[PDB]
Amino acid sequence: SLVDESLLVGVTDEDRAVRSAHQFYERLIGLWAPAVMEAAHELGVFAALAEAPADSGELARRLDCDARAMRVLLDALYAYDVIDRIHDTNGFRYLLSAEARECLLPGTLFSLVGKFMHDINVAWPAWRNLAEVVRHGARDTSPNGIAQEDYESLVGGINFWAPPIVTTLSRKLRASGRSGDATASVLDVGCGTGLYSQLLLREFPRWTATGLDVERIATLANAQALRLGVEERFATRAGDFWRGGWGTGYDLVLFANIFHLQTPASAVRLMRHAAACLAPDGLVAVVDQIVDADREPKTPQDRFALLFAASMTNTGGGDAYTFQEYEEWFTAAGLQRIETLDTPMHRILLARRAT
Amino acid sequence: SLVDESLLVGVTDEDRAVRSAHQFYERLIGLWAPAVMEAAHELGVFAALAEAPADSGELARRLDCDARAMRVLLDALYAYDVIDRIHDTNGFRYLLSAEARECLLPGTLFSLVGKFMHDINVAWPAWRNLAEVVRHGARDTIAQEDYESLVGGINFWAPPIVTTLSRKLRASGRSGDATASVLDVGCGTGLYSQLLLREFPRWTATGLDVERIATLANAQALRLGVEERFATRAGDFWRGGWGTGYDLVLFANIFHLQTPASAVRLMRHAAACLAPDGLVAVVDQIVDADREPKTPQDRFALLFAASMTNTGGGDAYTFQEYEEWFTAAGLQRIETLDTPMHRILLARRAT
Ligand SMILES: Nc1ncnc2c1ncn2[C@@H]1O[C@H](CSCC[C@H](N)C(=O)O)[C@@H](O)[C@H]1O
Ligand SMILES: Nc1ncnc2c1ncn2[C@@H]1O[C@H](CSCC[C@H](N)C(=O)O)[C@@H](O)[C@H]1O
């Protein structure tokens, strides 16, 4: 907390207005945290501290920065609980926890660096233009070189979502009678780095997976499959997935963080294509930010979904669609939803061909 | 909360890393809230809803916006608890609470609009350049256009601070029937002085600020009914001519703009302007020399220092540094008082 709420006591109209103003101000200054964290990334702070903890003066020397400003930046990161700081008689030493090392450094499996760079290069300028997008809207009538360049960074920056999602999905798949000793096949449409598929392949040693994405992303996905030891059972088909050629006979077709990019018309097209690629008894899994039609921020997942929709508007995307809309798309594809599972920031919808 | 933490439990190394990643992501997406709130201001959303609650389609018609994007924006504001939304059979209606109407609309006493505009015009672009400022530093050897907006946008800090200060002044034997005089150095809208004048009906106050801000301050004094006891002296307060004989000299949100050398100069000038038994009050973001984020005020002070670096400002100074400045001016601190986001230091001439 950045406001001592115990000092905002009172129940007059003025008291309540002043208290609200402090709370709104605290919300507004949430701007500062990404600015500090992303500046630290740009300067190399996290990689430097992971290699060798140091005081602000040493870090400023190593990173060719101003010593006073570096101390301010590091103490702000400490105040955000992003880095740790030990105080001795000699002085201070800043360092990263093992968890932060894994999240903040380039090149790790769960690195947020891709999210830092998406913010720096794309989201920060776009958010400043949000009013203009709300004024003018967007039209409904593959990713171009711009969006592909953006995804090149972003896909690695959202790897951290995958493990809880795959653990939940895998538990349901096992409980539904799907064995890791079966030679099942998975299709991962718009696979990004392929982490969802690749974690499934680690969980189910006899399965194989095919990921669809554009060429530059498919390259990243194959490299990560090798890093995860599943290279022999993971393959990519590079190109625009609207050009068909998905293969057939899949026991699982996965759409993670894909449907919110679509229009209703394109969503129905994708769902029907998935249904045509299913093996007997195959399943479609949708992982996305989904909210009830009442659009109430009841749960963390609902609240995030409503905020994420603003992010989609910010970059000219689709929407946080409702459960009811996904139901219509399942029906249009001859599928019926069999399960809805909560995950930390998403829902999983599982569907099979209607009986 | 935007993350269902009950679904990130576990104590393996991987479990802990993935949980931290979700928590860091949640921190990063704090960017979205000012963007949504400030876009809504730019579009006229808050003023429109305060006048007449409406569904998203009606508001889109009234504000000449896209209906789908307006619904997204309004539901995001609802998710942030900035606006309220009622669901009937007819449909939805968005509206503002009385508290929000006072905070979000232009022209109210506690309006955050000046903070919205400071962000839009100044802070947003600057924060994107923070790495360059850290690389290159700042020296010790536009802002007026900015302050014209920002000073009204920080009025909301004043009432809790003045209530705390006034309580201490009364407990220290200062009467509202005394013809005491206050100097408010860099007074901004003058709200601190003006609230003191309401609390202490026989006091008078002089605010120092640049001409355009002094104009705002005199207009607000009239709005608060204290016009006969509040006056401004317009100009650069480094050019002297502060007057003398003040029972209270107030520096609110001023010292963090200074260098150590300029801070000592200001403190000494205040001391020379004090009546016998006069007090200096410093209201600022102040932290212990250990710079530990123990309390909300300490944590905010450390983050505010980054905001100062962002705009090429001073620092969140330490209690120990203010003590040195008091000593250099022949003053001694007699009290430290916490407020929601600041500390008040009170000092008198040392005996
Ligand atoms: N028409 C298209 N053809 C191929 N890939 C596409 C595509 N439209 C979007 N994509 C890909 O879909 C992905 C969206 S981001 C989601 C990636 C991954 N499923 C995850 O959840 O982590 C990107 O990798 C993007 O390149
Ligand atoms: N040299 C100078 N001469 C006059 N006013 C100055 C000044 N340097 C800064 N100021 C004023 O100091 C104020 C800083 S903002 C703080 C305003 C007010 N005390 C409050 O706490 O709300 C601005 O109004 C700015 O114009």
* Residues pairing with B331 in the sheet: B349
Tokens at A13, concatenated: 């109209």
Tokens at B336, concatenated: 């430290």
Rounded to the nearest 5°, which phi and psi values hold at A68? -65, -50
d(CA A214, CA B10): 35
> What Å distances lie between residue B304 and A29, A72, B139, B179, CA to CA?
9, 9, 19, 37
B339 CB within 6 A, ligand 2: no
Tokens at A43, concatenated: 């300067």
Residue B205: in which H helix or E strand, if any? strand B204-209
Please, which contacts does B79-86 make with residues 24 or more away whose CB atoms are closer than 8 Å?
A: B79/A297, B79/A303, B79/A306, B79/A307, B80/A27, B80/A307, B80/B33, B80/B36, B80/B37, B82/A24, B82/A27, B82/B37, B82/B40, B83/B46, B83/B49, B86/B53
Nearest to residue A82, comparing CAs of A66, A71, A97?
A97
> What Å distances lie between residue B107 and B16, B168, B330, CA to CA?
48, 31, 42
What dihedral do alpha carbons B107, B110, B114, B115 form, nearest 10°?
A: -150
Output the CA A158–ligand 1 centroid distance in Å: 12
| Resolution to one decimal, Å | 1.4
Nearest C-alpha to atom 5 of ligand 1 is from which residue?
A213
Ligand closest in space to the Cα of A270 = 1
Nearest to residue A196, comparing CAs of A135, A109, A264?
A109
Q: What is the DSSP letter of A120?
A: I
Output the CA B303–ligand 2 centroid distance in Å: 21
Closest-CA distance, B221 to chain A, in angstroms, reads: 18
Q: What domains are there in chain B, each with its CATH number? A: 5-102 (1.10.10.10), 146-349 (3.40.50.150)
Tokens at A281, concatenated: 């008894």
d(CA A304, CA A292): 12
d(CA B153, CA B147): 9
Q: Is B190 left (phi over 0), alpha (psi -120 to 50) or beta?
A: left
d(CA B339, CA B336): 10
- Measured at the alpha carbon of residue A126, what is the angle toward residues A125 and A129, in degrees to the nearest 5? 100
B253 CB within 6 A, ligand 2: yes
B209 CB within 6 A, ligand 2: yes
- Chain-chain contact of A309 with B120 (C-beta, under 8 angstroms): no
Residue A187: in which H helix or E strand, if any? strand A185-189
> What Å distances lie between residue B275 and B198, B254, B280, CA to CA?
22, 22, 11
A80 CB within 6 A, ligand 1: no
Q: What is the DSSP letter of B311?
A: T
Tokens at B303, concatenated: 């983050």
At B333, which amino acid appears?
A: R
Residue A209: strand, helix, or coil: strand
> What Å distances lie between residue A37 and A220, A319, B27, B130, CA to CA?
25, 28, 9, 10
d(CA A292, CA A302): 8
Residue A351 near residue A305, CB atoms below 8 Å: no
- Measured at the alpha carbon of residue B128, what is the angle toward residues B122 and B131, in degrees to the nearest 5? 120
Rounded to the nearest 5°, which phi and psi values hold at A176? -85, 10
d(CA A270, CA A241): 9
At A325, which amino acid appears?
A: E
The answer to whether the annotation marks A241 as part of a ligand binding site is yes
d(CA A264, CA A322): 11
- DSSP calls for B85-149: EEE-SS-EEEE--HHHHHHHSTTSTT--HHHHHHIIIIIHHHHTTHHHHHHH------HHHHHHH
Tokens at A238, concatenated: 């590079």
Q: Is B208 left (phi over 0), alpha (psi -120 to 50) or beta?
A: beta
The answer to whether the annotation marks B253 as part of a ligand binding site is yes
- CB-based contacts of A129, cutoff 8 Å, min separation 6: none
Confirm or reject contact between A242 and chain B (CB < 8 A). Answer: no
Q: Which of residues 255-294 of A touch B (CB under 8 A)?
A: 294
Nearest to residue B212, comparing CAs of B149, B122, B123?
B149
Tokens at B127, concatenated: 């924060």
Q: Which of residues 114-153 of A touch B (CB under 8 A)?
A: 115-116, 119-120, 123-124, 127-128, 130-131, 133-138
Confirm or reject contact between A313 and chain B (CB < 8 A). Answer: yes
Tokens at A26, concatenated: 């605290």
Residue A45 near residue A62, CB atoms below 8 Å: no
Residue B232 near residue B208, CB atoms below 8 Å: yes
d(CA A104, CA A116): 9
d(CA A326, CA B95): 30
Rounded to the nearest 5°, which phi and psi values hold at B209? -165, 175
| CA A172 distance to own-chain centroid | 22
Secondary structure percentages of chain A, helix, strand, coil, to 5: 55, 15, 30
Residue A214 near residue A222, CB atoms below 8 Å: no
B36 CB within 6 A, ligand 2: no
| Entry field: residues in chain B | 351
Output the CA A344–ligand 2 centroid distance in Å: 46
Residue B36 near residue B16, CB atoms below 8 Å: no
Closest-CA distance, B106 to chain A, in angstroms, reads: 13
Ligand closest in space to the Cα of B147 = 2
